[PDB]
Point group: D2
Chain length 362, copies 4
Amino acid sequence: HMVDLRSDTVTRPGPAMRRAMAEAVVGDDDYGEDPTVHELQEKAAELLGVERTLFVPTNTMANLISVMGHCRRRGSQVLLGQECHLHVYEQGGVAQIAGVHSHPLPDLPYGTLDLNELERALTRGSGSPYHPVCELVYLENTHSSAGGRVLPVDYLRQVCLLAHAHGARVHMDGARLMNAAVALRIPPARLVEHCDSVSFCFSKGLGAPVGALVGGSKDFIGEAWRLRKALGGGMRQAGVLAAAALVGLAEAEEVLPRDHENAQRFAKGLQDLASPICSVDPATVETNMVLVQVAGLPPSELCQRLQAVSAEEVAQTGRAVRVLLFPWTEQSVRAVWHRDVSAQDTELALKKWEFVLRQLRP
Amino acid sequence: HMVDLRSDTVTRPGPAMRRAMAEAVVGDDDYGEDPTVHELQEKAAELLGVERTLFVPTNTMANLISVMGHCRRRGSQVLLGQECHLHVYEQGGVAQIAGVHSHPLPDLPYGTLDLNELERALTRGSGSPYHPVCELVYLENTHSSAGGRVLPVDYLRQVCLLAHAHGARVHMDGARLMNAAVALRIPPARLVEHCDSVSFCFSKGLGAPVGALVGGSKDFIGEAWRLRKALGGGMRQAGVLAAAALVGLAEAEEVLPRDHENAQRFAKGLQDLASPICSVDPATVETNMVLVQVAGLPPSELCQRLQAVSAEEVAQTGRAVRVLLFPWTEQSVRAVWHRDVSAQDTELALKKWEFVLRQLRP
Amino acid sequence: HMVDLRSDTVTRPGPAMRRAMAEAVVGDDDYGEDPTVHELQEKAAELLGVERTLFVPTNTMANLISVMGHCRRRGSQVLLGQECHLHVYEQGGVAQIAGVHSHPLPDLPYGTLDLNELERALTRGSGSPYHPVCELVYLENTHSSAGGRVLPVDYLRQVCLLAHAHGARVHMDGARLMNAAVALRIPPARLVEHCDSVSFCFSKGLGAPVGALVGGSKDFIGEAWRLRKALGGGMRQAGVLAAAALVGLAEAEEVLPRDHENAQRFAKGLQDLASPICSVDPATVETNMVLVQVAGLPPSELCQRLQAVSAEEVAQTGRAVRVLLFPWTEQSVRAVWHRDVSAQDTELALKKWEFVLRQLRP
Amino acid sequence: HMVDLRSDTVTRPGPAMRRAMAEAVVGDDDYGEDPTVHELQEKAAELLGVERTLFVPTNTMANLISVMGHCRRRGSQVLLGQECHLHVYEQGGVAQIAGVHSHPLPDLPYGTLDLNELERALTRGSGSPYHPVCELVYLENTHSSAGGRVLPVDYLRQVCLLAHAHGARVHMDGARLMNAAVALRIPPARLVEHCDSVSFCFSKGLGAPVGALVGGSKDFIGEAWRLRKALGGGMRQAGVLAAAALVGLAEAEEVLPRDHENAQRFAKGLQDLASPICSVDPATVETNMVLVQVAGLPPSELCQRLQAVSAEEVAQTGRAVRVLLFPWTEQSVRAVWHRDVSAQDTELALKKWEFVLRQLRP
């Protein structure tokens, strides 16, 4: 048996999604003739509170388009977090493709940036010609590398006040924005109100196979089209993909709460083991991610043992469960939940974790 | 009734394709865990005679990845045609994204480049440090802007001899490579043998909704992966799209011959009208495209009249056919055939053309 | 004896220039505290009829700054000539540094672009989002590769009318602008009136060791400063160089006429030889350059023989003159005059040419 | 009277330098025909222990060329300090020109990078294709923003061991490398032994008006030539500037010690005042810079008062000294010494500082 908690991107299409793709009404999106893509873009615009949206192949391209759309001036700068996904896991595309300078600030704690450090940075070269012009403050909600932490609304409000005062825009990587809205029990628009543009990903917790989009004003999306075209994201009959994304958008408020509960149950379960090797504070499990601190064992070996199966596992547990995880830091692993991990899969992953921990107990 | 000959990208998925998408076995392609994508990449590699292939969202990204993969040296240059699709209809991405210099040579005649001009250009800065280093010769087969002209094998052989002598690679934009192979009645590999890398598009004549790929050696595709990632083409469960592309690849040798026949029938039909306004040489209709020369009427108005319907059309023709076309040059329009244009649609488009021509006859 | 006609860049500083450098009042130009640089920028602004000017190290950087200043929009395009210096002999910097697309048009004939082809190109993607936006028309006066041909004022007037109608700017590479003004016997401002920005080079015919500048409006030069800084052209005590440039600017109207006369004398002299190997039309020698057509001998060997000295040369000529020249095309060489080539040096170069031609006469 | 301690770039040429420029033997450097430039490049290569050197207009271009020379791979990364000059005061050229990603690490303390953080960063994506490839570790000696701190030899040795193990090169911004060599009383080559390439600036403490250069192997300088050309640093008769740089290179070991003594005298003098507003630890004044901590007064106003002159200054001091300084941080100012600040100017600047401090004493 397999329980894959490496990422929520591994979500596979359900039967309602598979039917929607085979029954999609499509056209050439490059000509603006795909009705299902237009339906997705209009519904997502209403959900996010933006004027327009633009369907793209990946959330990577959506972030890259947004940065290029705000930071067009030669000698522009993005203020972002040093552990945000754009700065670490996107090939440095801000530089090698957008040609924009990046100024990273510490964000590990709770995915938030120190408002004092952010103000000092926004003021350093706010008018001096010797410094690059900060045209964008880049935010990520939820913050992936911090464990799926939720950015509060008031923090988002303070960032926009600080950015819009120094003549900068605000973009929010909302690759897991619905995970944040459900955690706060607020409509997603309340978070997007405090930003100029937003990314939104269907291929993670929502369960769609392919797709993301850029949200913003008409003018910003108007120029996002040319950038999508130049990067090679201007597909033809994309309504096949948008049909599946429409299904996941409707099931979001019902599917995502179960991912948060399963992650919280796992964190509480690991805590109830009182192991001197693994330590988790369930109060830090805000969404679908659990960061487990490891001691005395390299995190890679913990993932290797949890993925392997032994005859003694079948003895003291009963089942043979292969738990898939990623080593995150030098002293921690990361578990991500999604709709293909059932609550019974979660209990089985807890039992595998008990067995592995016991077989190496100091 | 609608007969859309603007482009072969408007092909809509058939029932076999719609079923394949709903029945696709998928995984995360970013982890290399989608079996249907791997099946498409292996079959296409055997079809094209390359070591590996890499599925991408669009043929635009496939060309951009190839140029970036060959022209990485700072101060690199691409030798290409001044009417090739990359140089005209791709937002100048060779420059604004790849940062590579372009040297266009005349290609309008038959999509071919003068081998003397190509040799003189390859020799100008072949060793001088004052000139950019030519690292790629860019070819397009079939050539779109010239009317779908087929590049002969011997011409491809001479280009590689000239390019590989001066230390340059050869990439072939094969957005309509199967249209060329069927026209020559040869396996597609015979054309790809004379190039280092190749693009291949499923979303045109093959009929798939979304998808293209890069073909080449293992090492070239190995680095194409990082470039696909940075540009935002690294999708997750792309096996949904690759399932439809596998169907069109199997129906290619049976679907494309009908597109060439319908285009040839139309060109002969227009010729049998002997109109002093429209003139076509059917000998120039090598694939699925027909360039119609217009006189005394702006090509935009000809497209407007062919798209419109009048009561007199219903009189002298019987049916109300809306023929969709694009104005190509200042004195010509362009018609492109595909599997959604039936042979009976072709005859109806001929009758609409007769009516329009007669109602403005000088 | 050496007569170096390879280029007019080989001009060495005179005693008045050497004194001006040692007596220059200088400061930190980066702080705007060098008075001699400010004096040069103000005098050149009055000479060219622009609002401001910005001293730069090379004419290469001046052209690169101008292109970057006009073509900042992502997906911008420059319309230029396929034999202009920017497109051929500047490492493709428009692409690898500015990230701008280039659309070259034929200019070899007389350094001019066909106004019909220029209008058809400016109209192709003037409003379509599928094409790059043409934001600059790039002109070169005098045109180097064509033999120092002068662009007429009326042609410059027609280009601006055509460019400013389609929302594009006009930049003029005036690396040899004074050579054109003296040829037309008009103030240099009459040429710059028909452009938005201009380059101007002191290190060629004017005789300065180092220096060039960008001319334009206050706002354009204001942003040219940031670009000069980013490229590494923001020098400190540049008044040392600007002092020598001020001397050459004052001697221009007296030094350059002698270069045109010496070149014209050489062209007439070569014609009076009636050789079936070398042919020049003196009517094509508009400035300080002479293109000599060669037959039966590779142009490289002609340069080798003219540079070499034999005992038979000392016999039938009397002196041993080493004439330095560059092979230009496959059938032509290029001679460029400057202030370090005296009129007596010109006669000696004619005699060397007679001897070489006679010793291989068919 | 003026005492300008804003920067050491304000050094003006001396009479020996002014004579050297007027007596320089020059040629076209673009053709490699300037003997004085070749003399400077050979002497500097012997001084630095590198194979070749390449004269450039500014130290900004020298750093930009080096980064571009090492980080050519698409998706390359530079590891540097977040307060190094390249990352803060160079328009973000690593991004907007070189297209390279930057990973800044904390360096403020002593200009050094934590070897553990540097190892963790070099190991994160050392082999993973999901991360950019670190091809350069960027060091600055002396570190400007930290107060001219000297990087020890052993630290340089440990950085190269760590960088060369993970397949990265090491470049050292030696804008003030001679200030470090004199401080350590070691030949400059001992520092350059622990790097692959080096920058070296003549226009600061050495006193030359214009000039810098890149040092490295033959192959690295060979490609630096093409990059210098593309950026517009390929000057013609640069031997005018190289003659002055040769004079400053010979006077370095005699001029720079006086700048360190004057700075140390000032730091001790300010300390002997025991003011609760200004505080300096003379042990932190390693070279020609003094960072003065300010309290109760914004650093801009302290610079304003020290620059202004009052009748009460002429009373209690005797002279009217205008001390020029830059505000550095929110709580500190920065003073930089050079050969145009005499030791008697230093004492006068101390007396002005006493007067200003006393007139606002809490």
